[PDB]
Design a protein around this nucleic acid. Sequence first.
DNA 1: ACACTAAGGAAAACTTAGTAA
DNA 2: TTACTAAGTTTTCCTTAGTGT
Lengths: 94, 94
Amino acid sequence: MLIRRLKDARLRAGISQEKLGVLAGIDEASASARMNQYEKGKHAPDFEMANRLAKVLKIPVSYLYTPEDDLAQIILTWNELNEQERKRINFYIR
Amino acid sequence: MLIRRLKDARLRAGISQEKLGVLAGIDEASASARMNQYEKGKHAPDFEMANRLAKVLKIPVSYLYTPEDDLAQIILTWNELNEQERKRINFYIR
DNA sequence: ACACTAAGGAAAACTTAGTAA
DNA sequence: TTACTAAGTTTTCCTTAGTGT
């Protein structure tokens, strides 16, 4: 998991490391420590948790694993497109 | 990491679980076991190994971590674009 | 060649109990 | 409050050594 994507998504959201964990379902006791470990690259969360974090952060989970700056932006933006906007890009791909 | 995504990518590369591990840097002696365990979802590779696996499979590492089928395709398809075709999309998104 | 699995040491994540701006 | 960390504990993985096609 890319620590910097985790930091940018959390900052845009406006919540602490501890808050993020609790909402993401991590136990109050270890929430603060764990969320800091992931954000400092000391440990990696597992994919389940990653999804849970993504859900709180209102981003697609794969943004967290996207190194390509240009692609990460596309994902972040695809996420917010409305019904027509996406239907446009779909015909585009196929 | 989504095992189904790993499997589909490998099959399109037209290579064995083993060869994949070998080319991805896993030692010959364990490459088969490991790559199978990943593909059956017994254990998940760490991100570094994911990245290695992706370079060999000629795909963006996000693909392995994207549960949405329509976003996965977008990622896969963006991958096939040239430097200019990508400037064309990056401006649409800025 | 190719897909696959149990077991147990190797290694990584999780928990606790904190400190530091 | 929020960020951060070491050390202990528990969990998951990598390697070995086989299975079967």
